[PDB]
């Protein structure tokens, strides 16, 4: 839609500081650094490569649009999250303890804040005694 397109063109310009029509790793880095983060050169090159389709090391507007249009729902970008919970599920059972969720969430990967995890467990709203229905947590995110 006309709104979405104008949306994406504005978002693109926020990264392409030089207005040369392309996004470089250092441009992405500048944005991420100004946002209070410090990502490694490898992390920037990973992000660019996941979007860059022509393999020239830079993201143009069509490549940008393509990513922003990629489905994150239904069929199955839903397994990877559903089984994402596989590793931490000791019991086969499709539940994981709230204590556990907090641990893996707060101490692994992107780490996350407690307030964010507080939001997670509150929004889940499912827990009989001490177990969390992560497959209803999957359905929640992929609505």
């Amino acid at each position: 839609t006309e709104e979405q397109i104008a949306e994406f063109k504005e978002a693109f310009s926020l990264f392409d500081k030089d207005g040369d029509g392309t996004i470089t790793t250092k441009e992405l880095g500048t944005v991420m650094r100004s946002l209070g983060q410090n990502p490694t050169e490898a992390e920037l090159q990973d992000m660019i490569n996941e979007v860059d389709a022509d393999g020239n090391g830079t993201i143009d507007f069509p490549e940008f649009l393509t990513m922003m249009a990629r489905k994150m729902k239904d069929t199955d970008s839903e397994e990877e999250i559903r089984e994402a919970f596989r590793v931490f599920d000791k019991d086969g059972n499709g539940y994981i303890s709230a204590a556990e969720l907090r641990h893996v969430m707060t101490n692994l990967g992107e780490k996350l804040t407690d307030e964010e995890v507080d939001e997670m467990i509150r929004e889940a709203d499912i827990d009989g005694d001490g177990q969390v229905n992560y497959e209803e947590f999957v359905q929640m995110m992929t609505a």
């Binding site: 949306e7 978002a11 996941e50 990513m67």
Partner: protein, 96 residues
């Protein structure tokens, strides 16, 4: 100067509206109340609406409201980039 030595008790009315001048002074007096009354209500409500972190009263600040729009936009884009990286990188660990 000199002494009055009482009056005379002399009854007569030589010489000699004000209703026009005071009626205009009364009309102008009320006319000043219209802007003041509106301003009081407006400023009072804006103090009330300011206590709400949401509400449309913060959208009246253009540069900042746009600064928030730009802020959220960049983050939404980055987080999706990080998602697809975390997506691909994952079952690269699930491919024997």
């Amino acid at each position: 100067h000199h002494h009055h030595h009482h009056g005379s008790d002399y009854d007569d009315i030589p010489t000699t509206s004000a209703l026009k001048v005071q009626q205009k002074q009364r009309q102008k007096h009320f006319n000043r109340q219209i802007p003041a009354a509106a301003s009081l209500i407006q400023t009072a409500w804006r103090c009330y609406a300011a206590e709400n972190p949401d509400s449309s009263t913060w959208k009246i600040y253009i540069e900042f409201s746009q600064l928030r729009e730009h802020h959220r936009a960049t983050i939404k884009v980055i987080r999706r980039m990080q998602y697809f990286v975390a997506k691909k990188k994952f079952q690269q660990a699930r491919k024997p």
